[PDB]
């Protein structure tokens, strides 16, 4: 029911993927380094209470009547729900507090990509908090209360709700389907693969930025799907687009979902064939994204898609080469990237005396 | 995880236990052909029979002819029914079409303007609605998406709302959820097992004046923004005074347990519970079935949170209208604003595998 908050790494990267997501990006409003470090300590203490299922501060009630409650209360009665809280620092953070020379070279600005249509209001951010849990209300309460505590030092720049499987009704041994109806996550780095995480996900000391050892680099892309167009495509177009069949998720010519793919049998611009590490010099990503449906836009269309999150040891050798290879992806007909951000995700909170960001400040 | 039976004298999704997630869609009709619209209603009912049992619509999600689009969009394959219910309603604007003018129920009342209303006309009204409730949100969206797909060219989605979590209860034996203000919401509601209160306050009766509505209900939807920044800097006493119940237990002021009966004269004169209580409104009683929502930021550095309020009642004129009129002085008004609104007549249930939605109207 709970996931331990402390560790060499932050939880919520290699740990079991929870049902729900509330992702929030913050901009910093203070110039005062001390004030920000104070806020980071306060957030860490709150993160400890939240991930264990307790209220923030002195609780949601029973305090002084003429004081506002420390905790806004909407998670009273709920369980920890495998809540994890992962914080990241955006490139723009390093223009403040005199940190410019501490920006990791692996925290690269993303190039412009063919077909990008990025909404500036839902891109970027000085820092982020990824809140995952099986109960969406536990996740929202976490973000809500962190924002309330940071008020006057940070504001919320943009926020994204997402969902994956519903674990109570779905087996953990079952690959979830994205909103295009294809199994999603078959060939991925799993949290059990310690040496693949070491090779592809975690920052190493030798990498050139010592404060980031044990950390990772995060790319977030808000990816709209053109649902109504996709759904008018023939079953064979859809399967041609990915290089797997829809029902079982097996590579073309093979029988089972987990049969290793034969890339020659796929069309040259099939998504799997272009995304595969063999087509990208070995480049390999940990994908940990979530589906979203935000409503319907002004033309009656379903505002829905994939909130794509990738973790990698170096953005220059993970997301960027692979996304570049998707220039000609047949999937591009049906999707559009409309938001984007990158973050340095620092190492974990080692113990009760540690705090978010301690190796950097 | 189990299914909720689709056939009945009433539509499910009303007195049914309240499921975790909501996808509510209002549709406008774009066809003039009454026969085309009846065909749609029959086809939608057939899809609903599959969807609420966990089956793909039509001939399934794959295995069909490679050159044709699949019947079911496929993203619910391998999922359980997840207590999905689908509830359909007819907006008053619909009765201007297909020569239904004289069949509009009297109890399908237009709502008056209320003080504080700031209603967005784009997120309001609608010829008809479909309330999809389920414990899995992928199941809920898949149902809306596939219903909208089947109606292409005869209906279009006007506006929709997702509720990520429930703020209502029809099962007083289970924990009462909390809304985003942190208070338990649903303690004194009507329970799915209280048959007499449902007949009395929720289900339309033959004698009420619209025979085709017998066994149906009437639905009021209000999209309500919450000023969480204002709320979150109010003291605990201020918060508890606004409602009349304490925040921790949810007990009426002065009492010890959530379910002790409120003693109204101990609440402030403008406390929300005092003004909404049936005893203050000549006995008027509602079935509340709403959900919380949050749709991003407000572009001013804050989270955008609200409550999608849904009430079922036997007659809007004797349900939502008097209670909301009595809320004109509610202390809660300082913290909320109504920003969308719609009413629908909800027809009786689909009786059997030969019946269909709206059959008693058409
Ligand atoms: C709407 C957007 C996207 C959808 C619907 C989608 C869908 C899929 C599907 C169905 C698979 C096959 C099953 C699996 O192995 O997970 C897959 C594989 C993969 N995708 Fe995507 N994808 C999207 C965007 C992206 C992006 C932006 C990237 C990277 C820049 C990416 C990288 C990959 C990788 C690395 C694999 C594993 C390929 C392999 O080794 O077999 N995908 N994706
Ligand atoms: C954001 C808006 C609202 C919030 C946060 C809210 C919250 C609450 C709370 C905390 C309670 C006490 C617990 C309970 O018995 O459910 C309650 C009760 C109630 N509310 Fe509201 N409410 C809202 C809007 C409305 C509206 C618009 C109406 C009617 C038009 C309404 C009608 C009622 C009724 C009838 C009760 C039951 C009172 C009783 O019989 O004891 N509420 N509400």
Author numbering:
A (entry chain B): 56 to 416
B (entry chain A): 55 to 416
Excerpt from the publication:
Herein, we have chosen to use an extracellular dye-type heme peroxidase found in Streptomyces lividans and referred to as DtpAa. The overall structure reveals a ferredoxin-like fold typical of dye decolourizing peroxidases with two DtpAa monomers in the crystallographic asymmetric unit. Heme enzymes catalyse many essential reactions in biology and understanding their structures throughout their reaction cycles is of high interest, prompting extensive efforts made to obtain ‘intact’ structures at high resolution. A major challenge is to obtain the higher valence states of these proteins, for example peroxidases (FeIII resting state and FeIV intermediate states), as these states are phenomenally sensitive to reduction in synchrotron experiments caused by the presence of large numbers of solvated electrons or other radiolytically produced species, generated by the interaction of X-rays with the crystal.
Serial synchrotron crystallography was carried out at Diamond Light Source beamline I24 at an X-ray energy of 12.8 keV using the same chip and translation system as used for SFX at SACLA. Following each translation of the chip to bring a fresh aperture/crystal into the beam, a series of 10 ms exposures were recorded using the PILATUS3 detector in shutterless mode. We first describe an MSS experiment series comprising five dose points with a dose increment of 32.8 kGy (MSS1). An increase in unit-cell volume and trends in scaling statistics clearly indicate the onset of global radiation damage resulting from disorder in the crystalline lattice as dose is accumulated. With increasing dose, distinct changes occur around the heme pocket consistent with reduction of the heme iron by X-ray generated solvated photoelectrons. A near-linear relationship is observed, demonstrating that water migration away from the Fe is dose-dependent under the conditions used. The elongation of the iron—water bond is consistent with FeIII to FeII reduction.
